[PDB]
Amino acid sequence: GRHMPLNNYLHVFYYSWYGNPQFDGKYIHWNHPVLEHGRHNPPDDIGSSFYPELGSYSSRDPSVIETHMRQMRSASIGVLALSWYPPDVNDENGEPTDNLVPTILDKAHKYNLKVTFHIEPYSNRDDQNMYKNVKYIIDKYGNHPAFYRYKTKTGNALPMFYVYDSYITKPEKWANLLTTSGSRSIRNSPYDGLFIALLVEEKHKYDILQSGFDGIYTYFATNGFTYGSSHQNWASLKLFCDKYNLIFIPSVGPGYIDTSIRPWNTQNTRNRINGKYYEIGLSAALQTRPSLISITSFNEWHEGTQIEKAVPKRTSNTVYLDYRPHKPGLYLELTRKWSEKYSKERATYA
Ligand code: NI
């Protein structure tokens, strides 16, 4: 772009699992029926610490999706990594979110954005059904003009898959799918792609290599929650990734708070302090000179990691956190500033 340049190397983690009565005949993923002790239910008493400018919205409302794409466009975010479960599983307490992918791709395309996939730890996820599911994703969505591909050092452009909780499956199983020799190898097929493992522990570095993964990411917004999410380890991981031609993708967040659904977890709470926590993380990511940067999150409201517009709100039961004294778009604007800084700086790397 020009006065709105889209950073194609900036990815944001995006969730399509919210529902309300209007569009889904019910409230879905806005509170948690884990607190009977209800007079604590939407649209007023959502479980999230912050309150969305769009209300207790529906991910399938196309005006919502539009708005989301406008907001991501204003942050200069080129790519959303969409949370994905397969359409053939038990997991989702609702209608399968794979149903929305085609709309999300269309709306994404209006605004010149791209969609990549963030594969959730669905039930019995293993190498075998991952093969089926990777095929499904590429067959169904791979030719859509908004489908994301990343250009390798070669020039060869590939689909990307962030695999959340990748450590759950053993390296010998990953290797069946992700090494050339593997019995179910996607290598050199039209199903090939760049698979990015979620690194939690230092130990995982070596497992990840062994497995045949093409990159690593860190996910968690709380600096210090894991070895991977701790900024002080990022230089070291970057070094390791460069040594072995892995794509290092640090994940930066604006803060963290989930005490609504986990009252005991105040240790992992990180106050936003008017954007400074965000800027500290962004800064530490840029310092590694990374090939990509990921943002946790566009709209993970339950973990309090969202950059999506939030508004002040008080009810009889709840006073929500908010972005005062700044505007609901504070994090979109901070993201734009740091995106531009990242475009400029990246153009100078090897
Ligand atoms: Ni313009």
Swiss-Prot record:
The record's account of tissue expression is:
Highly expressed in the liver and kidney. Expressed at lower levels in muscle, pancreas, heart, placenta, lung and brain.
> What does the record say about PTM?
Undergoes proteolytic cleavage in the C-terminal region.
Source species: Homo sapiens (Human)
Would you say which domain of life the source belongs to?
A: Eukaryota
What gene makes this protein? MANEA
Q: Which coarse location class describes where this protein primarily resides? A: Golgi
Single Gene Ontology MF annotation: glycoprotein endo-alpha-1,2-mannosidase activity
Q: Write the protein's name.
A: Glycoprotein endo-alpha-1,2-mannosidase
Catalytic activity, EC = 3.2.1.130
Span list, region Catalytic: 5-350
Q: Which reaction does it catalyse?
A: N-{alpha-Glc-(1->3)-alpha-Man-(1->2)-alpha-Man-(1->2)-alpha-Man-(1->3)-[alpha-Man-(1->2)-alpha-Man-(1->3)-[alpha-Man-(1->2)-alpha-Man-(1->6)]-alpha-Man-(1->6)]-beta-Man-(1->4)-beta-GlcNAc-(1->4)-beta-GlcNAc}-L-asparaginyl-[protein] + H2O = alpha-D-glucosyl-(1->3)-D-mannopyranose + N(4)-{alpha-D-Man-(1->2)-alpha-D-Man-(1->3)-[alpha-D-Man-(1->2)-alpha-D-Man-(1->3)-[alpha-D-Man-(1->2)-alpha-D-Man-(1->6)]-alpha-D-Man-(1->6)]-beta-D-Man-(1->4)-beta-D-GlaNAc-(1->4)-beta-D-GlcNAc}-L-asparaginyl-[protein] (N-glucan mannose isomer 8A1,2,3B1,2)
Q: How does activity depend on temperature?
A: Optimum temperature is 37 degrees Celsius.
GO CC aspect terms: Golgi apparatus; Golgi membrane
The entry's localization annotation reads: Golgi apparatus membrane
pH dependence as annotated:
Optimum pH is 6.2.
